[PDB]
A paper describes a structure:
In some pathogenic microbes, the response to oxidative stress is controlled by a SirTM/zinc-containing macrodomain (Zn-Macro) pair responsible for establishment and removal of the modification, respectively. Strikingly, however, the “catalytic loop” found in all other MacroD-type enzymes (also termed “loop 1”) is replaced with and extended loop containing the zinc-coordinating Cx(4)HxC motif, here termed the Zn-loop. To gain a closer understanding of the functional role of the 3α-bundle and coordinated Zn2+ ion, we solved structures from the three sub-branches of Zn-Macros namely from S. aureus (SauMacro), Methanobrevibacter oralis (MorMacro), and macrodomain-fused SirTM protein (Mfs1) from Fusarium oxysporum f.sp. cubense race 1 (Foc1Mfs1) in their apo form as well as of S. pyogenes (SpyMacro) and MorMacro bound to ADP-ribose (ADPr). In all structures, the Zn2+ ion is tetrahedrally coordinated with three metal-coordination residues within the Zn-loop, while the fourth coordination-contact is exchangeable and is provided by either ADPr, a water molecule, or a symmetry-related protomer within the crystal.
Author numbering: -1 to 260
Write the structure that this text describes.
Amino acid sequence: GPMNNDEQLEFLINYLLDERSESIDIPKTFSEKRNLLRSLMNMRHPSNISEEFLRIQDEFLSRETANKNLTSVEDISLSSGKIMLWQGDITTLSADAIVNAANSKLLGCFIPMHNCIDNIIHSASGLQLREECNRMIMLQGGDEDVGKAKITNAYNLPSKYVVHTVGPSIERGMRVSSDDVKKLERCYNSCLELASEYKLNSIAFCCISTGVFNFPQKKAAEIAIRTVKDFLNSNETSLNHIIFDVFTDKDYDIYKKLLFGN
Ligand SMILES: Nc1ncnc2c1ncn2[C@@H]1O[C@H](COP(=O)(O)OP(=O)(O)OC[C@H]2O[C@H](NC(=O)C[C@H](N)C(=O)O)[C@H](O)[C@@H]2O)[C@@H](O)[C@H]1O
Ligand SMILES: [Zn+2]
Ligand SMILES: [Zn+2]
Ligand SMILES: [Zn+2]
């Protein structure tokens, strides 16, 4: 009969355990049981899975998505021209496309429960995301360079597409080279160019390179804003709304000062 919420969750865990030959007792709460699935999903290198698993995975995750506090693009009220500014979780936002800050293998994040945007996006979207990116890397025959863009379905997310870009990474101790500036520009240009070719009306960016890859937050923002404006000045595009989705208070405050002059 109709497997309810707990019965679906408890199925999926057992599946991934039995494919790695073990079993640990199922924790008490819903919350701890939920993190075990995340953990098992994050850790699973790409390969075939049963259509039964996908179907049920999709029912479970779509439901979770539908029960969050979703935000529509037309409901963001802070805007300057086609640019909007918004603080919130990119997995709650109904844009045509969201941008993922990814790595050169484009497989997402293998640490259980890490809070990088790559893990967060793959954990809400589903295993199909890793599988689709893996088919694209295999056909390309080679890792993805910094500053390009690739597009995929968004699966159980509330958006339609995900755009994957790999930003530059700043070694601990070193200052930012003119070459690193140019590469982070190219991330923004590639993502705009791709969404333009797909004729999308809205895209949401995260603050690429500013977490694990350790780019200074203020300098990143000056670049992101100048690049987006030069692109909108210089091209025709179907884009009406380009959303800087910021996650930390400090990035909110940085972006707010530079866009809305105090
Ligand atoms: N929900 C959210 N919505 C909006 N913005 C958010 C959200 N959450 C965070 N964010 C924000 O997204 C921005 C992007 O930060 P970020 O660290 O995700 O990305 P970054 O571009 O600076 O770095 C990307 C790299 O690290 C990952 N890799 C790992 O984590 C692997 C590891 N080093 C290993 O040893 O195994 C990933 O595969 C790639 O390799 C930040 O401003 C957060 O506040
Ligand atoms: Zn509109
Ligand atoms: Zn991570
Ligand atoms: Zn193209």
